[PDB]
Design a protein around this nucleic acid. Structure first.
Ligand SMILES: [Mg+2]
Ligand SMILES: [Mg+2]
Ligand SMILES: [Mg+2]
Lengths: 629, 628
RNA sequence: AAAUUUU
RNA sequence: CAAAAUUU
RNA sequence: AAAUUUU
RNA sequence: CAAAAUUU
């Protein structure tokens, strides 16, 4: 049946899954060890210290979770919605058990309290530093109090309608028309082309993951929706089946400061799959086309930027051609509220990296409608035949971004009082944020051309954004700094962070490679707060995260490189060469430097160079058949 | 992360493994039912009759398995061999537990006395006919007695050296030189190119399957063997490690007549992996090049022939251009001892389909050496740079086919006394048989050109092959028959079987398709004796075998088509659309006819046409974005 | 599967 | 993990 | 995985 | 199943 070559491939594939034999075969194998930091104490002592810290964190979190949460009076109320009765064959779309107290759609918000990574950290670095950094922040569900507080900040903020046109958006957000999907083709194929998180909630009315809910959305609800869209019949469908247009307001689990646990917890909105999917066609095509600022000088857009393969250097070469403030144009780039501003002053280059507080709450209805228009238009320009249909989708998109009815906890249904303010979680969220941001910063530069250079000062800039745009600058982020225009080996660009990373220069054979960087404390904080079950898979997760952080820029910090190296070298060979979804290479300093330089891509150095042959139990060995006998 | 199209494919692949949900999803689906025969009796009554037949067969088999087996005096004896001590890294090549009583290599022969196919048959066809056909034959390991008797027949037969040259073999077995492997390259790659049964025994000294034993052969034993081959040092390696050149004699499990259980049990020889692989390079390349008789008028070779895609018709058009016996050349084709002879007599076309008795025992040393030479030569002609090495492999091939030392049961080692007689199991077995056969039949035709037409008669032909070639014609197989040169719809070519099948013509659209056929009794015999455990997998096996038989030609017999249809239609939908190694189509009469006709290939009709969408839970439905 | 970033 | 961007 | 075929 | 040939 099979050939020997194929039989060997077939047996190699299975050997990487037989971890007992992999462990047996790789015992005592030559191993390329990573640069590593010495161990400070034993794994058992380290477990004890980790256990201790985890306990302190659990009790502080529980404390903050017991705080009273201010009422939800600031939201309009639409009573209770009935459970959707739509059936797809043998089963209902809305499952029988879930999200239904009786008749009415209900929802229960999750705030729970309460690490192998913290253990490792205690194993390889100074106890007191690990302790205080692991107590500064924590990955958690947040608190009811801070949830409601940030929700109020983002649903009730006094906004300022922006002054925007397609002319302006063409200027600030150039794209490449020929990279837009052909949006006139059948809807089914177009929807089948979009990408999505298979594990994410499909939202109402499916109340399961998207891979679970895909057929029910696809052959049942989406055709009904289409029927009613072209029949101009949407509001009677909204009446017959309210749950089809309902969202769920949810608390984002992530890294939070512990001291601020009762003030800060991000809210976001889960939308129905059939609506998000429909809009995603346009959204994702547009993301496909959008140029970034290193490609096109007029662009204010950094959404699509990459640090790797020259990106850092590109950012530098871009920035450093900014003009004298008041005379020539500055260099401004935005990714959401995360902005990077460069400007000159008596020839000398300066940089500012400001953030905005609850940026969603500052995004105005005019801006949202203008962006939806700009996208739909960008498509129907290239593909006129479908104009009407997608315009009818635009009307939906906007009502989804500004005025969706939504659940929070239990059966009550709410809605934002004003049209202004973005419902974070809607398709296009990041783009709306980026746009509003760039529009404001463009008005800023325009005011600089009219001699208002006192807008370069914290004092007046805060006023400007508050009064002219409704943007609240997270204080202390407007601190302009002198740029080291041409850094020497090991020197920073500035100490400021853009997209969470400092820019730095490193030596490579007398060349200067621009790379990301952070101080050790930051890398260690990221190490000890992973975002999330055999011993094996956990050991592998440790390995993977170490590699990841190294690649992100931890290899360019002394202490962090040592810690990640120690983790890697602890990893048992079976776990390194394991079949996972294998890569059994580690990132050396040199390889990562190559990753960020413009070099052609290439594979990581193998941890066990001769592992393939040791596993397969067979080298090739040249045997000449032309030999004389 | 993923796209919806891909997510749906991913979800479809897993739904075909969840048989509960598969059953649920297919509950009310349209089913393309196969042509079927009505039920003769209930499932429980049929179970009772099957149980009964199984009991009678078990006790007859046990009886025949207890018979005394005549001594092994007819074989040379070389005593006991020591267990090979070669190590490959951390473990020995010869595992610690197995095939070692102490110090010495030992082997234990398996004769066990051991049906729901029979159940199905009793359910859907006449009770008495099913009973007697299921008692005529049985799939079994055989008996010690018949094992030793046939071993004696194939190791001690008085042979007749054939009269052979490369000239003759070029004539009878033409090939296409440019389809031969470039055998001058590196050995590793060439050996990696050969195909093999991954589950088969690698034989001594590995004593495990070939996929288990592949690395040990590949990076350890094969280099040692090469070293000693080019160093001209083979016999001292044979001395240091005898088990490297040892074979295992084995009893073939298969379909046996119950009446003949103590007279007939096929022996064959499992050879070492490192030797078989090395020879396979040449053997398989040559098979790649070898022409067949429907390609080349001079060829006597039918090894490579296919019934499908016109093959049957090709056989007809070939045959019917045979000449008047004594004046012009006949048409003769061989596949092992299975031969097909066509000749004319006063213009009228005749056919003969004779077989030989234990043909391996009749295969002479001259023929084996000549074939090995012909193959090695065919290669080193095209690729001279590699001559010596492959010539040294030829010497091995020959000693492997004629004179291998071998085990049977226990520790004693034996060897064939004579060089004559082929050791079935060696690489190239079928080709050696085909050549010996064709050589004899060519001498037959040559005697026909010299006016000896009484060789067309059973009485003198049997003599001819016995005396001039050592070939013993299984009696009653030389019965020449008048060919229906141009058959009408539904008529046979002749009633004779070649490659186990009758030739027949069926109608399609006023056109005649040539197809294989067998009488019902034969299809039923094959049905009730399968060759080899959940409810699921057994229910699926019934389905698979029914499909298989239908495709082989059972769809062209009424009663057999009905039985296979009934089996297929019994198969629960979950089992049809199950993820297996899916195909969830059945072979309709029309599709099988297309298979044997010259039509372009195409897939079987789905049993459940709308099953894909029912499983995925989505049928595409065009919704146009250009609507007002 | 994993790392980082934004809302 | 609601939408997303970069990377292995 | 399955069917047929030769030794 | 020891070598194999044809086939899905
Ligand atoms: Mg912010
Ligand atoms: Mg025969
Ligand atoms: Mg015979």
């Amino acid at each position: 049946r099979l050939s020997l070559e194929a039989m060997l491939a077939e047996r190699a594939m299975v050997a990487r899954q037989d971890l007992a034999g992999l462990k047996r075969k790789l015992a005592g194998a030559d191993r390329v060890l990573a640069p590593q930091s010495p161990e400070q104490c034993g794994r058992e002592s380290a477990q004890a210290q980790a256990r201790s810290v985890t306990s302190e964190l659990k009790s502080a979190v529980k404390e903050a979770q017991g705080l009273e949460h201010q009422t939800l009076d600031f939201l309009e109320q639409l009573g209770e919605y009935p459970v959707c009765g739509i059936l797809h064959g043998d089963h209902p779309v809305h499952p029988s058990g879930t999200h239904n107290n009786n008749g009415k759609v209900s929802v229960k918000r999750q705030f729970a309290a309460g690490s192998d990574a913290l253990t490792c950290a205690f194993r390889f670095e100074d106890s007191d530093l690990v302790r205080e950094t692991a107590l500064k922040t924590t990955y958690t569900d947040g608190t009811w109090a801070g949830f409601v507080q940030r929700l109020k900040m983002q649903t009730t903020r006094k906004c300022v309608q922006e002054k925007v046109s397609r002319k302006l958006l063409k200027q600030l957000f150039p794209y490449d028309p020929q990279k837009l999907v052909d949006v006139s083709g059948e809807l089914s194929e177009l929807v089948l082309g979009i990408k999505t998180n298979a594990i994410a909630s499909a939202g109402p009315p499916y109340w399961r993951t998207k891979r679970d809910a895909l057929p029910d959305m696809l052959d049942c609800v989406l055709p009904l929706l289409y029927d009613h869209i072209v029949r101009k019949d949407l509001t009677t469908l909204r009446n017959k089946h309210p749950e089809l247009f309902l969202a769920e307001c949810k608390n984002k689990t992530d890294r939070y400061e512990v001291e601020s646990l009762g003030e800060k917890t991000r809210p976001y909105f889960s939308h129905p799959f059939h609506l998000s999917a429909l809009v995603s066609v346009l959204s994702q095509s547009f993301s496909g086309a959008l140029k970034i600022m290193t490609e096109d000088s007029t662009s204010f857009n950094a959404y699509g930027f990459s640090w790797t393969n020259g990106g850092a250097e590109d950012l530098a070469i871009w920035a450093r051609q900014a003009g004298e403030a008041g005379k020539k144009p500055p260099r401004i780039a935005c990714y959401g509220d995360d902005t990077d501003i460069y400007y000159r002053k008596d020839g000398k280059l300066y940089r500012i990296c400001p953030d905005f507080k609850q940026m969603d709450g500052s995004v105005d209805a005019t801006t949202i409608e203008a962006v939806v228009d700009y996208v739909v238009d960008a498509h129907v320009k290239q593909y006129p035949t479908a104009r009407q249909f997608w315009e009818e989708v635009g009307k939906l998109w906007v009502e989804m971004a500004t005025q969706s009815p939504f659940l929070i906890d239990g059966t009550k249904v709410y809605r934002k009082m004003q049209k202004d303010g973005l419902m974070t979680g809607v398709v296009g969220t990041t783009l709306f944020d980026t746009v509003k941001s760039a529009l404001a910063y463009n008005d800023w530069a325009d005011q600089l051309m009219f001699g208002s250079l006192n807008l370069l000062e914290e004092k007046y800039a805060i006023e400007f954004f508050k009064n002219k745009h409704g943007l609240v600058i997270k204080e202390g982020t407007w601190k302009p700094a002198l740029v080291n225009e041409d850094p020497g080996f090991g020197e920073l660009w500035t100490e400021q962070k853009f997209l969470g990373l400092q820019l730095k220069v490193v030596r490579r054979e007398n060349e200067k490679v621009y790379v990301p960087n952070l101080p050790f404390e930051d890398w260690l904080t990221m190490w000890v707060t992973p975002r999330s079950e055999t011993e094996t898979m956990r050991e592998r997760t440790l390995f993977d995260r170490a590699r990841g952080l190294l690649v992100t820029g931890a290899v360019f910090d002394e202490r962090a490189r040592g810690l990640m190296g120690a983790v890697i070298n602890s990893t048992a060979p079976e776990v390194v060469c394991m079949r996972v979804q294998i890569s059994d290479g580690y990132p050396s300093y040199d390889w990562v430097v190559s990753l960020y330089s413009r070099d052609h891509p290439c594979d990581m150095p193998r941890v066990f160079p001769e592992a393939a042959t040791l596993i397969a139990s067979y080298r090739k060995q040249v045997m000449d058949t032309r030999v004389v006998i």
